[PDB]
Design an enzyme around this catalytic site. Structure first.
Site, PDB file in Angstrom:
ATOM      1  N   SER A  16       0.799  -1.225   0.000  1.00  0.00           N
ATOM      2  CA  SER A  16       0.000   0.000   0.000  1.00  0.00           C
ATOM      3  C   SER A  16       0.829   1.272   0.000  1.00  0.00           C
ATOM      4  CB  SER A  16      -0.936   0.031   1.199  1.00  0.00           C
ATOM      5  OG  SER A  16      -2.042  -0.818   0.949  1.00  0.00           O
TER       6      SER A  16
ATOM      7  N   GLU B 213      -4.066  -7.221  -6.519  1.00  0.00           N
ATOM      8  CA  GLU B 213      -3.019  -8.085  -7.085  1.00  0.00           C
ATOM      9  C   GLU B 213      -1.618  -7.532  -6.874  1.00  0.00           C
ATOM     10  OE1 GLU B 213      -5.950  -7.113  -8.760  1.00  0.00           O
ATOM     11  OE2 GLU B 213      -6.791  -8.994  -9.527  1.00  0.00           O
TER      12      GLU B 213
HETATM   13  O1  LIG Z   1      -7.422  -5.111   6.770  1.00  0.00           O
HETATM   14  C1  LIG Z   1      -6.450  -5.577   6.218  1.00  0.00           C
HETATM   15  N1  LIG Z   1      -5.343  -4.888   6.014  1.00  0.00           N
HETATM   16  C2  LIG Z   1      -5.455  -3.470   5.802  1.00  0.00           C
HETATM   17  C3  LIG Z   1      -4.390  -2.909   4.854  1.00  0.00           C
HETATM   18  C4  LIG Z   1      -4.050  -1.507   5.345  1.00  0.00           C
HETATM   19  C5  LIG Z   1      -2.597  -1.267   5.416  1.00  0.00           C
HETATM   20  N2  LIG Z   1      -1.721  -2.081   6.010  1.00  0.00           N
HETATM   21  N3  LIG Z   1      -0.487  -1.448   5.909  1.00  0.00           N
HETATM   22  N4  LIG Z   1      -0.617  -0.330   5.263  1.00  0.00           N
HETATM   23  N5  LIG Z   1      -1.950  -0.176   4.959  1.00  0.00           N
HETATM   24  C6  LIG Z   1      -4.483  -1.508   6.761  1.00  0.00           C
HETATM   25  C7  LIG Z   1      -4.195  -0.589   7.770  1.00  0.00           C
HETATM   26  C8  LIG Z   1      -4.714  -0.821   9.058  1.00  0.00           C
HETATM   27  C9  LIG Z   1      -5.510  -1.955   9.306  1.00  0.00           C
HETATM   28  C10 LIG Z   1      -5.813  -2.895   8.306  1.00  0.00           C
HETATM   29  C11 LIG Z   1      -5.286  -2.686   7.043  1.00  0.00           C
HETATM   30  C12 LIG Z   1      -6.500  -6.979   5.746  1.00  0.00           C
HETATM   31  C13 LIG Z   1      -6.333  -8.011   6.653  1.00  0.00           C
HETATM   32  C14 LIG Z   1      -6.382  -9.316   6.188  1.00  0.00           C
HETATM   33  C15 LIG Z   1      -6.593  -9.552   4.836  1.00  0.00           C
HETATM   34  C16 LIG Z   1      -6.759  -8.516   3.927  1.00  0.00           C
HETATM   35  F1  LIG Z   1      -6.972  -8.773   2.617  1.00  0.00           F
HETATM   36  C17 LIG Z   1      -6.710  -7.214   4.394  1.00  0.00           C
END
Ligand SMILES: O=C(N[C@@H]1C[C@H](c2nnn[nH]2)c2ccccc21)c1cccc(F)c1
Length: 260
Positions: A39, A137
């Site tokens: 991200s 992806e």
């Molecule tokens: O929620 C998820 N991650 C996001 C991605 C996002 C972020 N992580 N690092 N930078 N941005 C972020 C930030 C805070 C909390 C959650 C998340 C996730 C978990 C399992 C599987 C999945 F498919 C996504």
């Protein structure tokens, strides 16, 4: 020696680049290697959007409507406005500050896709950055795959240009800074190493596989010039987990190497 011990205890590779923008002192460790952006590309996406607003008045206030089909897993802001719509600036802040995936893909479409964001990075002198794919992806983080990667040095150099140099006009430059300052996802990464009374803006990345996660930040100490730094990790095995503590620790070592 401390980064090597840290990455060996982590079980993978840590890449660090840190610049004191006053003295030009630098800390560097694996700073040329490619790491998945995950991200973290969304910070540069917002900067690209901002650069477009320098030629399309009211682009930032232009509303963007979207349907259930635009929603992507982890779209915590955009999904509450599904029945309503959001502005370009609102999407950008969501992408930067909550890592909102639907917002990121919507802004990517407005920019001409991954190649359009890569074009913007080339325009500011970054020959390393590449985005190839969309959310989700682009998070595959496959070892040795250069898609959707940059280097710690190129991330820090581009971040410096965009937040402290002249790649953006001053209003857009301060908007970019203000978006990064308001990030909510980075409290356990570079921010955890930064003295409490210093200003900081960052953008995180977490791919979810191959121990791959990252953060980059611009830091404003009091009474010395700002510091820019990037900390990227990966690991050799698909099931290896990332570590926020490792990112915080690498950041601490970088800041101490610049005399913090
Ligand atoms: O929620 C998820 N991650 C996001 C991605 C996002 C972020 N992580 N690092 N930078 N941005 C972020 C930030 C805070 C909390 C959650 C998340 C996730 C978990 C399992 C599987 C999945 F498919 C996504």
């Amino acid at each position: 020696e401390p980064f090597a011990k840290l990455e060996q205890d982590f079980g993978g590779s840590i890449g660090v680049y840190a610049m004191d923008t006053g003295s030009g002192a630098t800390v560097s460790y694996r700073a040329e290697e490619r790491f998945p952006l995950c991200s973290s590309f969304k910070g540069f996406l917002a900067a690209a959007v901002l650069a477009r607003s320098q030629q399309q008045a009211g682009l930032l206030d232009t509303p963007i409507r979207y349907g259930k089909n635009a929603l992507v897993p982890w779209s915590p802001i955009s999904e509450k406005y599904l029945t309503t719509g959001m502005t370009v600036a609102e999407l950008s802040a969501a992408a930067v500050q909550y890592s909102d995936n639907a917002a990121a893909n919507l802004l990517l479409k407005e920019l001409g896709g991954p190649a359009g964001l890569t074009a913007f990075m080339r325009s500011i002198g970054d020959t390393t950055f590449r985005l190839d794919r969309w959310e989700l992806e682009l998070n595959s983080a496959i070892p040795g795959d250069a898609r959707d990667t940059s280097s710690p040095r190129a991330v820090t150099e581009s971040l410096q240009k965009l937040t402290l140099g002249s790649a953006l006009a001053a209003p857009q430059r301060q908007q970019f800074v203000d978006w990064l300052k308001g990030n909510t996802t980075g409290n356990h990464r570079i921010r955890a190493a930064v003295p409490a009374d210093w200003a900081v803006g960052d953008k995180t990345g977490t791919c979810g596989v191959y121990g791959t996660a990252n953060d980059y930040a611009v830091v404003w100490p009091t009474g010395r010039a700002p510091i820019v730094l990037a900390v990227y990790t990966r690991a050799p095995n698909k099931d290896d987990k990332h570590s926020e503590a490792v990112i915080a620790a690498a950041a601490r070592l970088a800041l101490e190497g610049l005399g913090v």
